Design a protein around this ligand. Structure first.
Ligand SMILES: *[C@@H]1O[C@H](CO)[C@@H](O[C@@H]2O[C@H](CO)[C@@H](O)[C@H](O)[C@H]2NC(C)=O)[C@H](O)[C@H]1NC(C)=O
Ligand SMILES: *[C@@H]1O[C@H](CO)[C@@H](O[C@@H]2O[C@H](CO)[C@@H](O)[C@H](O)[C@H]2NC(C)=O)[C@H](O)[C@H]1NC(C)=O
Ligand SMILES: *[C@@H]1O[C@H](CO)[C@@H](O[C@@H]2O[C@H](CO)[C@@H](O)[C@H](O)[C@H]2NC(C)=O)[C@H](O)[C@H]1NC(C)=O
Ligand SMILES: *[C@@H]1O[C@H](CO)[C@@H](O[C@@H]2O[C@H](CO)[C@@H](O)[C@H](O)[C@H]2NC(C)=O)[C@H](O)[C@H]1NC(C)=O
Ligand SMILES: Cc1ccccc1[C@H](CC(=O)O)NC(=O)c1cc(=O)n(-c2ccccc2F)[nH]1
Ligand SMILES: Cc1ccccc1[C@H](CC(=O)O)NC(=O)c1cc(=O)n(-c2ccccc2F)[nH]1
Lengths: 153, 260, 260, 153
């Protein structure tokens, strides 16, 4: 993909001793971050996940989280905020900022949370496409709150 | 209890041995597909910690990117030799299953080498791979299952979750999608607005977009048939993804510099 | 030729002596106003380099912030003792005049201690200070003059430039304004749009703003008399500048943390 | 001002030996980054700089530059881009990105430039309110091009 440097991971995973430690059969071709041939041959079928999410929310057994880094342009935060809102779920909560405790810098706004029953949309302020790479502490805090079914604030 | 054939004993580039158990092998997908997985057990109480599946997008990109560059227990350094422990690793509180999917992605393969696939096929193949994971790791069958992913996994995860929800043996508790593709229409319409309000497009291009793509209060930047609209959206496509701006992080540099 | 009374000999916190000459003293403004200046000569050919005036905004904030934290020859380190040379200093190619203005700002003062002022008074006082600078530094009279500033200096600079343009003895060549206040209307209207498209306001607050502040295609977030509009804009004002977000850099942390 | 830490500059300028080196009379009160009393007593007279800029542009003798860090919310880039455009000047040029050469990272987009005759609007990508603090190299490059009356690209 453009503007990305994948050399470090590519150099590591293509090392023969790394492949042996990872139990990779020797005959297999070299490791590429993204397989161009798979992408080219891939037939995209769905245009919207609306029905899939409504099917998952109907059971009321699953906690759903859609999180976006607000400085990403590939899959921007607004597209996903609109999507979550369009699902029109019960128990709509007022949009609020969510906090993260940074070392000695104190409590900081890590982004904004829009919550409904069994579904929440989250922004990660200053993060791009790869949220845990850009904001690792904010990504962990969000992940921890998601697993434990805790409010994101 | 666990596949001892798949367990990683000593991983190169690590200065210290992991406190947690880790596995690298193959899960059986649909037909003749063998999906490479890298499973990292929880650093704190793996037996009671949730099982988390991680899928990177593309389509065609490896979930090993998620491990070594995003939220894995160790991260690859610029030398491409050294791995350094991540204090914000997702495996601190969860058993993380990184799956290279579909077949052909990274170390994943198929016996027929036929890698032409679709959304419905990938969901079914990922479901069969999940069934195979629980066969190889029976001690995790009753553990809380979470399906997570990034980008195109916005399609991978909900389609997979609809199949998982029909399986009573799988303890599905939830799903998380990072910067995911949920709707092509919503993504394309919001991006044009994102590009203008982030100062990538001028008032001249925006006025032309608002006049030829929009009606009253609503805008159509997705499937608009208007002549100048297609031309203007193509200019937006050139500015956003082909001018030298990093589409993945607007305020970050573009690796390799601005193109010629 | 130059005020030797004002020349800085040895500045504390500097590990190395400057290659350029620097002056710190007072310029006479209007009435009994004495404006403190810190003039840093060009590191490369000061005799032919342009004269650049720098004004910080507020109103009431010091231009010494511009020197020690922004584009000065040396920058104050977190210890508040050490000064480190700036390789991107504006004085590498220009003679930079940092002026603490109006009276009362930083080290600037007035003999009557009366610091109540206005836009027209500050412009006239800054013009008299500029005339005084050329009296103290006659060797710079014929040098290219540029009037620069930040924030409220978006008012300070153009008002001053209109007075400077009427003086044939001043070699005015141009003006530069950084993140400046040019129009209250344009700034307020654009900020509401900026806050929504940067994900600070939700669809509920935005829909309410678009319905109660806007008509057809045009929006009024500046002088709107509408009831809910004033209420909604006050909520925007609370989110943007009173919630814990850094108004000066959205993606930077708020120094001292989020308020109680 | 909120969310700003001015302690370092305040600690330095309030040191008695620094004041002596800067020829500051000893009787004067302590140095404050921003004077609250000056701000409180200040009477704002102008609401727009439109007439001032048109008066300066009428002579055709001065080069005007309005530059904004695109992540600032106090005096955001759009307000100033609208302002420059509203002046309706001759020789309008197509909006283009402007480049900066970073160490070994190569040529990067430092922002966008909107040029007219004797006036140009510039964005500084990733910079806030204090452009030279956040992006010093991009700020110097822009400043150098401005003084030398060179195109910003
Ligand atoms: C792309 O990434 C690689 C790997 O991170 C960069 O190469 C490294 O460069 C540094 C500095 O010269 C060295 O210390 C490392 O040992 C290099 N690693 C490898 C594997 O060669 C490379 O410079 C980057 N390229 C671009 C254009 O950004
Ligand atoms: C998605 O891919 C699957 C697998 O390649 C397609 O399903 C197979 O289609 C062939 C005919 O082309 C049949 O012989 C197989 O029995 C099908 N398999 C299954 C499991 O149904 C499927 O048609 C593709 N979908 C689309 C819309 O292209
Ligand atoms: C505000 O700024 C001051 C000055 O930069 C900070 O104090 C410094 O803290 C570091 C780390 O403890 C010390 O090494 C410096 O010597 C301190 N300088 C001074 C002058 O005390 C202070 O921590 C900052 N406060 C906040 C809330 O961000
Ligand atoms: C701006 O401030 C100036 C100076 O304080 C005001 O001008 C003076 O006004 C007093 C009366 O209040 C007169 O006695 C002086 O002769 C005026 N001086 C000059 C130079 O004209 C001015 O009125 C203020 N402007 C506004 C609109 O408040
Ligand atoms: C940006 C990136 C880097 C490394 C790994 C994955 C990705 C992402 C997916 C993710 O965030 O999980 N990739 C893309 O956004 C993307 C779009 C696209 O067309 N590709 C791609 C796929 C196959 C071959 C080349 C490609 F550029 N990759
Ligand atoms: C943010 C800042 C820090 C340090 C110095 C100046 C400033 C800026 C002005 C500039 O960028 O040049 N200040 C403001 O934006 C600002 C608005 C405002 O009300 N003040 C202010 C003025 C006097 C007293 C307290 C203040 F907060 N300061």
């Amino acid at each position: 993909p453009p503007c990305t440097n994948t050399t470090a991971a590519s150099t590591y995973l293509n090392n023969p001793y790394v492949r042996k430690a990872l139990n990779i059969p020797e005959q297999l071709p070299q490791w590429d971050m993204c397989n161009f041939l798979v992408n080219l041959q891939y037939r995209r079928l769905y245009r919207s996940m609306n029905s899939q999410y409504l099917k998952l929310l109907s059971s009321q057994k699953y906690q759903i989280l859609l999180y976006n880094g607000d400085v990403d342009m590939a899959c921007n935060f607004m597209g996903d905020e609109w999507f979550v809102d369009s699902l029109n779920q019960k128990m709509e909560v007022q949009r609020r900022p969510w906090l993260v405790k940074y070392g000695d810098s104190g409590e900081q706004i890590a982004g904004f949370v829009k919550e409904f029953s069994h579904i929440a949309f989250l922004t990660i302020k200053g993060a791009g496409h790869m949220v845990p790479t850009d904001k690792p502490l904010a990504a962990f805090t969000m992940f921890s709150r998601f697993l434990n079914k805790q409010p994101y604030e | 209890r666990a596949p001892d054939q798949d367990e990683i004993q000593r991983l190169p580039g690590l200065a210290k041995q992991p406190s947690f158990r880790q596995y690298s092998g193959y899960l059986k997908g649909s037909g003749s597909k063998h999906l490479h997985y890298w499973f990292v057990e929880s650093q704190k109480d793996p037996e009671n910690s949730p099982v988390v599946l991680w899928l990177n997008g593309g389509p065609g990109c490896s979930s090993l990117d998620g491990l070594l560059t995003e939220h894995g227990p160790f991260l690859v350094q610029p030398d491409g030799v050294t791995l350094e422990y991540n204090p914000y690793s997702w495996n601190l509180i969860a058993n993380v299953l990184y799956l290279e999917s579909p077949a052909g992605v990274g170390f994943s393969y198929s016996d027929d080498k036929f890698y032409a696939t679709n959304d419905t096929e990938v969901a079914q193949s990922n479901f069969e791979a999940l069934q195979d994971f629980f066969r190889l790791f029976p001690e995790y069958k009753n553990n809380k299952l979470f399906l997570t992913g990034e980008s195109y996994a916005g399609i991978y995860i909900p389609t997979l979750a609809v199949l998982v929800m029909q399986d009573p043996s799988m303890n599905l508790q939830g799903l998380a999608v990072g910067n995911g593709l949920s709707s092509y229409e919503q993504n394309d319409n919001s991006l044009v607005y994102f590009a203008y309000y982030h100062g990538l497009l001028g008032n001249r291009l925006w006025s032309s977009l608002q006049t030829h793509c929009c009606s009253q209060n609503k805008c159509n930047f997705y499937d608009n048939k208007d002549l100048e609209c297609v031309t203007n959206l193509q200019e937006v496509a050139r500015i956003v993804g082909n001018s030298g701006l990093n589409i993945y992080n607007l305020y970050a540099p573009c690796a390799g510099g601005v193109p010629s």
